[PDB]
Amino acid sequence: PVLTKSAGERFLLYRPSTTTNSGLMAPDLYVYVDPAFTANTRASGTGVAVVGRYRDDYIIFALEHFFLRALTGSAPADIARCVVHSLTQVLALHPGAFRGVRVAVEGNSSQDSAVAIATHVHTEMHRLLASEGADAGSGPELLFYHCEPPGSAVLYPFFLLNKQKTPAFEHFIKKFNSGGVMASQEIVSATVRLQTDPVEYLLEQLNNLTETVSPNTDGASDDLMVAVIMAIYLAAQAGPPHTF
């Protein structure tokens, strides 16, 4: 009973443009992912959310509820074609617009996969722009979120979701029923059908939030929602993420 329907008419309604108003953006680009490694489950998709900043508010570029296909031996790489296949589409319609992006991968499933997952992300990102697109000779310049496991001093490029979920939700609903965030007119999708609305598909899933401690997800398929909210909590300030 959380996100107001007055905001939902607004957040569904207004379609601002980042093709023209790009110069009024922060040149950085947070992006989150939520890998779920099982298949054939209505909440086991993998979320994509990529967000930028205006002066004080936040703005959405692409959402992919990435299911797992059947018969997967190369499954982390497929997730890597998802998220990089998104970032290339954002950077594509935004020529010379962004300085550097920051990919976030959660490791609540395991710390083991996300290392080679983000490594395989930097692999294909490091592949693509040198092939074609434009002459951005290391233009959009990737960095990652490098975290520390509890009890291990070695920094790996991942993100724990331990203490952060409640201030992230409180930040998101702090902004969202105030009409802070918005979704771009040129919001990008690959997995969701170009016929159907992406923003409608988000807003259905946004409508399953819960109380002051927020034990959420009544339901199914929170991954887009949880993805957007961790993405926007990193769209504000926190500890520094860095280069790989």
Numbering used by the authors: 476 to 693, 703 to 728
Sentences from the paper on this structure:
Examples include herpesviruses and most bacteriophages, both of which replicate their DNA as head-to-tail concatemers containing multiple copies of the genome that must be cleaved to generate unit-length viral genomes. This is achieved using a “terminase” complex, which, in bacteriophages comprises two proteins, termed Large (TerL) and Small (TerS) terminases; but in herpesviruses contains three separate components—pUL15, pUL28 and pUL33—in hitherto unknown oligomeric forms. The terminase complex recognizes a specific sequence or structure on the concatemeric DNA and cuts it to produce the free end where packaging is initiated. Acting as the packaging motor, the terminase complex then hydrolyzes ATP molecules to translocate negatively charged DNA into a space-limited procapsid through a dodecameric portal. Each subunit of the hexameric ring is a heterotrimer formed by three proteins (pUL15, pUL28 and pUL33) interdigitating with each other.
After a unit length genome is translocated, the terminase utilizes its nuclease domain to initiate a second site-specific cleavage step, leading to the dissociation of the DNA concatemer from the filled capsid and the start of the DNA packaging into another procapsid. Recent evidence has demonstrated that the nuclease domain is dispensable for DNA binding, and that the ATPase domain is the primary site for DNA binding and is required for nuclease activity, suggesting a concerted mechanism for DNA cleavage. In our structures, the nuclease domain resembles closely the RNase H-like endonucleases with conserved catalytically active residues like D509, E581, D706 and D707. However, the nuclease domains are distal from the central channel (~45 Å from the exterior of the channel) and the catalytically active residues are oriented towards the sides of the channel in the hexameric ring, which suggests that head-full sensing relayed to the terminase complex through the portal would reorient the nuclease domain to be proximal to the central channel for DNA cleavage. The regulator linking the ATPase and nuclease domains might be involved in this re-arrangement of the nuclease domain. Notably, the two regulator domains, one from pUL15 and the other from pUL28, are positioned on the two sides of the ATPase and nuclease domains, as if to act as hinges to regulate conformational changes of the nuclease. We suggest that, upon receiving the “head-full” signal either from the portal or ATPase domain (possibly recognizing specific DNA sequences), the nuclease undergoes conformational changes around these two distinct hinges to switch modes from translocation to cleavage.
